């Protein structure tokens, strides 16, 4: 997440508000001074230095993380943007259109804008390219994993913040005393724009026993809930048949048309687009628009505010109308009891903001403040006729102090507890802290219980026993978080491999067409979705599509959802193919790939390097998130559930599921556990609260947290004299370095009532 | 769980742990027992807080 933020997101934030234009009017009493000036400051490429520190006297030198911890410094690096200055002049002739020209004052020029704190072992950090002997030279422990910041000497970890996913249509049942039966709401969000969140709620008024059940939507900047038919007519869809066609996609679904009949009877006398836009224009919350302009104002509400995640440009009213019909369709499907209400605790509908997106939004706010300060200083210099100094224009302390304050304190703004002091009691405690997540809790869901969708993504038994029980979650061992990719290549490939656009989609002529969703945006329909899903899966398994992209085919409701956004928690799984040579389903990974992996592993301790990405690129393994996990069948073990079918009474009873249609296999079930629970020997022979208690108390143990404790001046440090690796050990802790940095001793233990003491 | 087929109301599908603690839990049984233990811990914390309120 941090490498994605530094490599790509910083430039995106710079380019989103790069141009800053101040028009100085002529303000001429006489025609002698009829010249108008237009000063433009534009940011260009952003550059990041290696980590460094400037002292009091002004000498600046390369800063290494050992020195930043000892001297209570901040392990940060400088940001330098290219700024080009444009000065334009135009002859201010009234009536004549102004035509600006350059006066050839195009001076351009790296300028320092602030210090970004550098996560350790990231690509900008010095420790990423360092070998083991280099780390020992720098007095850094090679067992140290990075993933944290050094702010004023303190090691600060950013806890992953769990939020609801954006751009998803969620339908909920309201309470009985409420006049609304069901609400279909969407938190429309955009990434490549102003990053503003708009809530759109389509509500079915009236209870089941009531007869006048109408549907009204809550548009942004509109005080009253507009009826849906008026919104459809304001979106250019006047006739009632086309509105019900956009809402109800089956001509035989007469009950949904019955429940839509009071809606079309409600806004009946409004039969024009202009009348509907006037009706929306009456309820505008600005309350300052003249007679002829409210139409345009309503169009503004229907262009830049009503469902911004679809489009913000003009001429896209058909897609917004189809998506509104889709939301009403979902609402009425929940109202007709064809589908249940959306599970708010479903982990596929959640996103995890890691150090990338959190620093992304923080830097976006800080850079907006910096650009406002630049404009204010520039306006003050041109108005009060002072000289312009670029060193005074750009206050780098804004960016530097904002990042330093939001990382030193837990406060994320101007959300608390986002940044925490890294635990260094034991090595496993640090490992568990670096994979810790947090769910901020005022809803009617049940976020504290372990959900079904939490399988293989967060640890089933690793949570605090206190008020943070269930809200603080720890990732399982193989669980990862997607950093987000560009959906535009996937959209282009879909449009160029037979996805009909939504503009020319008629539901009655194409009743079997499958809706295609990319990041919650309905982009069109496909007549043959099985071939499309096969092509997309082959592209993802050969690496042409990024493996973090999730592709879900819901065959029942005829939907194809593609997610490329960040925050999705996925896990790797084996691929099970047809394998016609053996006549039955088999894993694509074979003994030859295993031999290549072990050859590479023992080379690491001359043949070709065969790594995890080699398995990923050959389609042997795949990344599956909780949304894609709903459409697959996973075998627990390869040698038991794949091949077609006396028993040891000591072994546990295990079923084979009596079904051979598997698409995936678990790599190992023990990877559902987190870092702390992987220390537990035989956790399947324990009661689950005891596993939770041990996952809590393993962080309080004593061991060797780092091998360079002699050169670290930590506030408190506890080191056992004689750590011992456990006699009973798990395979998983071989990857947790528990046999290298143990946290206990093998004591000869008698279970006896010896003395009553 | 994604390891079961749709509409499976068998005891092993919906959370019956046929194995003892001696024989060890299957991974599905392990996860279902983890859900039960998590519900127990949540109920314990909520009960303690509400009963402290009631007692005061």
């Amino acid at each position: 997440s941090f490498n994605q933020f530094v490599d790509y997101t910083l430039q995106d934030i710079i380019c989103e508000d790069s141009t800053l234009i101040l028009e100085q009017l002529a303000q001429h009493t006489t025609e002698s001074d009829n010249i108008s000036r237009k000063y433009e400051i534009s940011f260009g490429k952003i550059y990041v230095t290696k980590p460094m520190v400037n002292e009091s006297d002004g000498v600046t030198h390369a800063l290494y993380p050992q020195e930043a911890r000892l001297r209570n410094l901040t392990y940060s690096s400088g940001l330098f943007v290219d700024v080009k200055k444009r000065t334009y002049e135009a002859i201010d002739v009234p009536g004549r259109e102004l035509k600006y020209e350059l006066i050839a004052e195009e001076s351009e020029g790296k300028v320092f804008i602030g210090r970004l704190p550098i996560m350790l072992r990231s690509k900008n950090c010095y420790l990423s390219e360092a070998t083991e002997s280099d780390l020992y030279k720098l007095k850094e422990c090679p067992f140290d994993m990075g993933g944290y910041f050094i702010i004023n000497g303190s090691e600060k970890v950013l806890i992953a913040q769990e939020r609801s996913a954006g751009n998803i249509v969620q339908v909920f049942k309201k309470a009985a005393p409420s006049p609304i039966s069901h609400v279909a709401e969407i938190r429309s969000a955009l990434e490549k724009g102003s990053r503003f969140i708009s809530t759109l709620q389509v509500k079915l008024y009236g209870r089941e026993g009531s007869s006048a059940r109408t549907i009204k939507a809550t548009l942004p900047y509109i005080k009253q809930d507009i009826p849906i038919v008026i919104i459809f007519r304001a979106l250019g869809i006047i006739p009632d048949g086309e509105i019900l066609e956009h809402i109800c996609y089956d001509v035989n679904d007469w009950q949904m048309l019955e429940m839509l009949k009071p809606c079309v009877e409600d806004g009946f006398v409004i039969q024009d687009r202009e009348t509907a836009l006037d009706f929306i224009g009456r309820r505008g919350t600005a309350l300052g628009i003249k007679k002829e302009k409210r139409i345009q104002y309503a169009k503004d509400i229907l262009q830049k505010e009503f469902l911004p995640h679809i489009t913000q440009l003009e001429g896209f009213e058909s897609r917004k109308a189809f998506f509104l019909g889709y939301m009403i369709n979902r609402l009425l499907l929940c109202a007709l009891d064809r589908k249940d209400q959306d599970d708010r605790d479903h982990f596929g509908k959640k996103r995890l903001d890691l150090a990338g997106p959190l620093l992304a939004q923080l830097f976006k706010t800080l850079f907006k403040k910096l650009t406002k300060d630049i404009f204010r200083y520039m306006q003050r210099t041109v108005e009060e006729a002072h000289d312009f100094n670029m060193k005074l224009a750009i206050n780098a302390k804004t960016i530097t102090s904002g990042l330093k304050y939001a990382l030193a304190t837990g406060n994320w703004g101007e959300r608390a507890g986002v940044s925490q002091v890294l635990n260094r009691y034991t090595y496993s405690s640090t490992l568990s802290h670096l994979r810790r997540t947090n769910t901020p809790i005022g809803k009617l869901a049940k976020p504290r219980q372990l959900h079904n969708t939490h399988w293989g993504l967060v640890c089933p038994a690793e949570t605090p026993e206190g008020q943070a029980c269930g809200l603080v979650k720890n990732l399982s061992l193989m669980s990862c978080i997607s950093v987000g990719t560009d959906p535009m290549p996937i959209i282009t490939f879909l449009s160029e491999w037979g996805m009909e656009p939504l503009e020319d989609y008629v539901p009655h002529q194409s009743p079997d067409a499958t809706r295609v969703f990319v990041n919650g945006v309905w982009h069109g329909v496909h007549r043959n979705p099985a071939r499309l899903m096969e092509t997309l899966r082959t592209l993802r398994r050969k690496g042409d599509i990024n493996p973090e992209v999730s592709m879900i085919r819901d065959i029942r409701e005829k939907e194809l959802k593609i997610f490329t956004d960040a925050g999705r928690v996925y896990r790797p799984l084996f691929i099970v193919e047809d394998d016609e040579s053996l006549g039955h389903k088999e894993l694509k990974v074979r003994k030859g790939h295993i031999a290549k992996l072990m050859a590479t592993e023992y080379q690491d301790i001359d043949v070709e390097e065969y790594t995890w990405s080699s398995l990923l690129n050959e389609g042997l393994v795949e990344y599956i998130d909780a949304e894609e996990e709903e459409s697959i069948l996973i075998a627990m073990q390869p040698e038991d559930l794949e091949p077609a079918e006396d028993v040891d009474p000591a072994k546990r009873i295990r079923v084979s599921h009596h079904a051979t249609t598997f698409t995936h296999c678990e790599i190992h079930p023990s990877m559902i556990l987190g870092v702390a629970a992987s220390i537990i020997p035989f956790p399947d022979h324990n009661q689950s609260p005891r596993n939770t208690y041990q996952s809590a108390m393993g962080k309080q143990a004593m061991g060797v947290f780092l091998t360079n404790y002699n050169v670290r001046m930590d506030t408190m440090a506890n080191i056992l004299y004689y750590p011992q690796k456990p006699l009973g050990t798990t395979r998983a802790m071989e990857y947790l370095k528990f046999r290298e940095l143990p946290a206990g001793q093998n004591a000869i233990v008698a279970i006896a009532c010896y003395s009553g003491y | 769980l994604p390891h079961f087929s749709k509409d499976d109301y068998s005891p092993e599908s919906k959370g019956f742990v046929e194995n003892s603690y001696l024989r060890g839990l299957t991974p599905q049984e392990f996860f279902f027992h983890a859900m039960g233990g998590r519900e127990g811990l949540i109920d314990t914390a909520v009960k303690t807080a509400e009963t402290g309120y009631i007692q005061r």
Partner: peptide
């Protein structure tokens, strides 16, 4: 300070639950 997972109830601290239910 400290970071312990040994859950120690804050005593005489029912005002958390009092603020949970001030509406009847």
């Amino acid at each position: 300070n400290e970071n312990f997972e040994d859950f120690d109830v804050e005593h005489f601290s029912d005002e958390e639950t009092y603020e949970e239910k001030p509406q009847f």
